[PDB]
Amino acid sequence: KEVTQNEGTKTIANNLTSTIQVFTDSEYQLPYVLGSAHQGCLPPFPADVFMIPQYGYLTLNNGSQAVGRSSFYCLEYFPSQMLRTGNNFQFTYTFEDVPFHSSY
């Protein structure tokens, strides 16, 4: 959707020819930011509507300064699917063997 703001009057319309891009980091080449207990997961209540979190990452630092080994990543340097309205994305994943959690 595109939003148009003139004269304090704001309007929202569809942009039919617009795309979004999606990809999975299947090869684990980006810093993994899940697992740090952040906000922005899907809501517990199904009826709730949610906002997607922004992605950011960290590398080595000395004070406020970078060091030699500090790394920069561009996500646009990965292949991604482009979807218009009417396109969809899916994938399947299998968990590795892991021990049962003890509910006892």
Binding site: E27, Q29, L30, P31, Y32, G68, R69, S71, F72, Y73, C74, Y77, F78
Partner: protein, 103 residues
């Protein structure tokens, strides 16, 4: 701890010795072990071949990495080379860890 690969079954020890050659024995029997021997040494060549398996880098890092490099500027002699006197020397220690990988 000093570094390296630890193996239950490492490359085996290889032991080499010159066989003893006795100098002339006495002409009537004596039971004592011989203590007079001809003087000997040996020389030869030895070859070792090893196959190493490599793991290639898979980095998505945009910017360049650190690399081991030879010195750019002029010098009295070449690093990792001989002397005017024919003495090879290794100037610095070189480690293994230049490329980077995320955690």
């Amino acid at each position: 701890l000093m570094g390296g690969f630890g193996l239950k079954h490492p490359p085996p020890q290889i032991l080499i010795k010159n066989t003893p050659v006795p100098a002339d024995p006495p002409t009537t029997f004596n039971q004592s072990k011989l203590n007079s021997f001809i003087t000997q040494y040996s020389t030869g060549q030895v070859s070792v071949e090893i196959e190493w398996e490599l793991q290639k880098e898979n980095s998505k890092r945009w910017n360049p990495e650190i690399q081991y490099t030879s010195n750019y500027y002029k010098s009295t002699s070449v690093d990792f080379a001989v002397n005017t006197e024919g003495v090879y020397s290794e100037p610095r220690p070189i480690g293994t860890r230049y490329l980077t990988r995320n955690l």
